[PDB]
Design an enzyme around this catalytic site. Structure first.
Site, PDB file in Angstrom:
ATOM      1  CG  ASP A 170      -1.760  -1.309   1.288  1.00 58.21           C
ATOM      2  OD1 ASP A 170      -1.144  -2.378   1.462  1.00 58.21           O
ATOM      3  OD2 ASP A 170      -3.003  -1.258   1.217  1.00 58.21           O
ATOM      4  CG  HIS A 336      -4.068  -6.283  -0.993  1.00 59.53           C
ATOM      5  ND1 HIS A 336      -3.045  -5.372  -0.810  1.00 59.53           N
ATOM      6  CD2 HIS A 336      -5.221  -5.589  -0.832  1.00 59.53           C
ATOM      7  CE1 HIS A 336      -3.557  -4.179  -0.553  1.00 59.53           C
ATOM      8  NE2 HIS A 336      -4.877  -4.282  -0.562  1.00 59.53           N
ATOM      9  CG  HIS A 346     -10.001  -3.337   4.841  1.00 60.43           C
ATOM     10  ND1 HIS A 346     -10.996  -2.981   3.957  1.00 60.43           N
ATOM     11  CD2 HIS A 346      -8.999  -2.442   4.665  1.00 60.43           C
ATOM     12  CE1 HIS A 346     -10.612  -1.918   3.273  1.00 60.43           C
ATOM     13  NE2 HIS A 346      -9.404  -1.570   3.685  1.00 60.43           N
ATOM     14  CG  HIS A 373      -6.694  -4.712   2.355  1.00 61.30           C
ATOM     15  ND1 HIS A 373      -7.081  -3.805   1.386  1.00 61.30           N
ATOM     16  CD2 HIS A 373      -7.830  -5.308   2.786  1.00 61.30           C
ATOM     17  CE1 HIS A 373      -8.395  -3.852   1.245  1.00 61.30           C
ATOM     18  NE2 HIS A 373      -8.874  -4.755   2.083  1.00 61.30           N
TER      19      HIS A 373
HETATM   20 FE   LIG Z   1      -4.238   0.070   0.669  1.00 60.02          FE
HETATM   21 FE   LIG Z   2      -6.176  -2.656  -0.162  1.00 60.19          FE
END
Ligand SMILES: [Fe+3]
Ligand SMILES: [Fe+3]
Ligand SMILES: *[C@@H]1O[C@H](CO)[C@@H](O[C@@H]2O[C@H](CO)[C@@H](O)[C@H](O)[C@H]2NC(C)=O)[C@H](O)[C@H]1NC(C)=O
Ligand SMILES: *[C@@H]1O[C@H](CO)[C@@H](O[C@@H]2O[C@H](CO)[C@@H](O)[C@H](O)[C@H]2NC(C)=O)[C@H](O)[C@H]1NC(C)=O
Ligand SMILES: *[C@@H]1O[C@H](CO)[C@@H](O)[C@H](O)[C@H]1NC(C)=O
Ligand SMILES: *[C@@H]1O[C@H](CO)[C@@H](O)[C@H](O)[C@H]1NC(C)=O
Ligand SMILES: *[C@@H]1O[C@H](CO)[C@@H](O)[C@H](O)[C@H]1NC(C)=O
Ligand SMILES: *[C@@H]1O[C@H](CO)[C@@H](O)[C@H](O)[C@H]1NC(C)=O
Ligand SMILES: *[C@@H]1O[C@H](CO)[C@@H](O)[C@H](O)[C@H]1NC(C)=O
Length: 504
Positions: A170, A336, A346, A373
């Site tokens: 990221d 990821h 998430h 992520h």
């Molecule tokens: Fe990201």
């Molecule tokens: Fe992501």
């Protein structure tokens, strides 16, 4: 530092400190500093074995806006000259060229098409050895790069490892990204793993206006999730000092979807990087495997079908069955989306991927998982199916590379922050697999009310990790934060000890 031999450690949460700014298109490091067909965005990638490697580059400026005219890739050759000394580039390899476009059939949106991308595989390389190379088209005056150099991975064996493997996710392209990359390069890694979410081109409209959060700003007022593809070229130009000298393995994240005309996805990601798809027999840019010394790496796709009936799963079964742990004692995976992140952001989003693949990986003694992520740092205790398990993998999430999206700061176990279950599954992949726990301290709930005991360490800071595999049973992991710059700063450190007689 601790060692996993001591068993799981009492969970630690680093108190929060109290966005990042994208590099402007005026930044000298993202401007085009070559002319004509001279190579730019030069990058090295590993092949499946240390005895081969990929060199990739772009020739020609991109086109953004107006009536873009895709270039004919056959008009510029794909040649690498290489050798063991800078003044003796007597070996030659040729490769393939391609272009990609980013097209939107909506009034007011602007189209993009790339320069010519080249990918050349160098074969017959000695492991653990420095190779000098030039890339380009020698039949076009001025169209060969300067001489660059990279070192191949060490030979595959149980005492043979790359000194330092950098792990980031990221990144994006902000000033904080440049801090992450400067810290990473100062650690002089032999190899870089980039766990998805590369340029964040999809934080921009096609007319170049950006945002820290597309869904917040543009989700409601645009006909599609737009991108500004030049951010990829800016990223590739900025990263060239690293990628031209250090092999970099990329796997896709959700920001690489970049849906465009005809529901085409992943165009930039699939075209720009080299992957050992053929050599590792994945025949996919989205997942693949490779050996770096005595480490067998598996890069998995959180955004390609991962169900037990699908192609990726069947490939993974065959890949694992070929691993000989007396030759590659270490089995390490990257993908990821984390399976055991405890941040609200998430939370349990990839549960269906865990349910599909976790038992298979556990049955083969997966040692370490790296993910991105989540925009924070987290390290798990050894865990399998939410249970502390001395044969479970260590899950480490380093999605804190510095992109302009907000940091993950709230934890699902923070009072009142446990998300609604049906809000958590990944919309692109579909499915729902995240059921309430039926045992343990959080039985009957979707979240804990304190840091889960499988979470060893979590901190909301940007940074990067370095893995130093020492021998067939011991590896040193260090995570380095960005706001620390003094010599030798380390935010988290663990000796990872594997116990094959216990677990295999
Ligand atoms: Fe990201
Ligand atoms: Fe992501
Ligand atoms: C960008 O490329 C696309 C595809 O080549 C063009 O898409 C057209 O857009 C109009 C509406 O603006 C549609 O009615 C057409 O059906 C689309 N064509 C296709 C092949 O799908 C678009 O014209 C291009 N944009 C610019 C500014 O040139
Ligand atoms: C991203 O980079 C910016 C700018 O380099 C950082 O901003 C500084 O944050 C520290 C505290 O860690 C403050 O002492 C400084 O005053 C800030 N400088 C400016 C110009 O605002 C920012 O901290 C970085 N973000 C993260 C999450 O590390
Ligand atoms: C790009 O388009 C959006 C929405 O149509 C608009 O709000 C924005 O101001 C535009 N940016 C530029 C540089 O034109
Ligand atoms: C559109 O593209 C994605 C990714 O390949 C796919 O999952 C999705 O099902 C496709 N949508 C349709 C209507 O086919
Ligand atoms: C994981 O835990 C759940 C709940 O105990 C159980 O139903 C499931 O079968 C377990 N999965 C595996 C692979 O053991
Ligand atoms: C699961 O746990 C949440 C709280 O985390 C609770 O609100 C919800 O009702 C539970 N659902 C079931 C089926 O137990
Ligand atoms: C393996 O590496 C660790 C750390 O460098 C070292 O302590 C150990 O002696 C080495 N070899 C073993 C235990 O066989």
């Amino acid at each position: 530092p601790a060692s996993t031999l001591e068993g799981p450690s009492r969970p630690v949460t680093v108190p929060l400190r109290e966005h990042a700014v994208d590099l402007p298109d005026t930044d000298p490091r993202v401007q085009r500093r070559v002319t004509g067909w001279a190579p730019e965005q030069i990058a090295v990638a590993l092949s499946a074995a240390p005895t081969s490697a990929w060199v990739s580059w772009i020739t020609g400026d991109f086109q953004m806006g107006g009536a873009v005219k895709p270039l004919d890739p056959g008009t510029v050759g794909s040649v690498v000259r290489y050798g063991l000394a800078a003044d003796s580039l007597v070996r030659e390899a040729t490769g393939d060229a391609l272009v990609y476009s980013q097209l939107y059939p909506f009034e007011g949106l602007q189209n993009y098409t790339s320069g010519i991308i080249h990918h050349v595989r160098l074969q017959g390389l000695e492991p653990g050895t420095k190779y000098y190379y030039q890339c380009g088209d020698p039949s076009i005056p001025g169209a060969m790069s300067a001489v660059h150099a990279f070192r191949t991975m060490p030979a595959v064996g149980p005492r043979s490892y790359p000194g330092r493997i950098a792990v980031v996710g990221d990144l994006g392209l902000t000033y904080n990204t440049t801090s992450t990359v400067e810290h990473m390069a100062s650690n002089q890694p032999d190899l870089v793993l980039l766990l998805g979410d590369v340029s964040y081109a999809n934080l921009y409209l096609t007319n170049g206006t950006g945002t820290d959060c597309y869904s917040c700003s543009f989700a409601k007022s645009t006909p599609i999730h737009e991108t500004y593809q030049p951010r990829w070229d800016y990223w590739g130009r900025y990263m060239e000092p690293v990628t031209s000298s250090t092999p970099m393995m990329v796997v896709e994240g959700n920001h690489e979807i970049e849906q465009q005309i005809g529901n085409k996805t992943f165009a930039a990601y699939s075209a720009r990087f080299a992957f050992p798809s053929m050599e590792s027999e994945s025949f996919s840019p989205f997942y693949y495997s490779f050996d770096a010394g005595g480490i067998h790496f598996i890069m998995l796709a959180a955004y390609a079908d991962y169900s037990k009936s699908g192609e990726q799963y069947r490939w993974l079964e065959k890949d694992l069955a070929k691993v000989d742990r007396s030759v590659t004692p270490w089995l390490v995976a990257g993908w990821h989306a984390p399976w055991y992140s405890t941040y609200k952001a998430h939370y349990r989003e990839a549960e269906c991927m865990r349910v599909a693949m976790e038992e298979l990986l556990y049955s083969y003694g997966l040692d370490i998982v790296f993910t991105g992520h989540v925009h924070a740092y987290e390290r798990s205790n050894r865990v399998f199916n939410y249970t502390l398990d001395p044969c479970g993998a260590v899950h480490i999430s380093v999605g804190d590379g510095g992109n302009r999206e907000k940091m993950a700061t709230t934890h699902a176990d923070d009072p009142g922050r446990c998300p609604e279950p049906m809000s958590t599954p990944d919309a692109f992949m579909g499915g729902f697999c995240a059921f309430n726990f039926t045992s343990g301290p959080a039985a009957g709930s979707f979240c804990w009310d304190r840091q889960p005991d499988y979470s060893a360490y979590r901190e909301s800071s940007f940074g990067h990790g370095i893995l130093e595999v020492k021998n067939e049973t011991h590896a040193l992991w260090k995570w380095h934060r960005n706001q620390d710059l003094y010599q030798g700063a380390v935010g988290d450190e663990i000796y990872i000890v594997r116990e094959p007689e216990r677990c295999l």
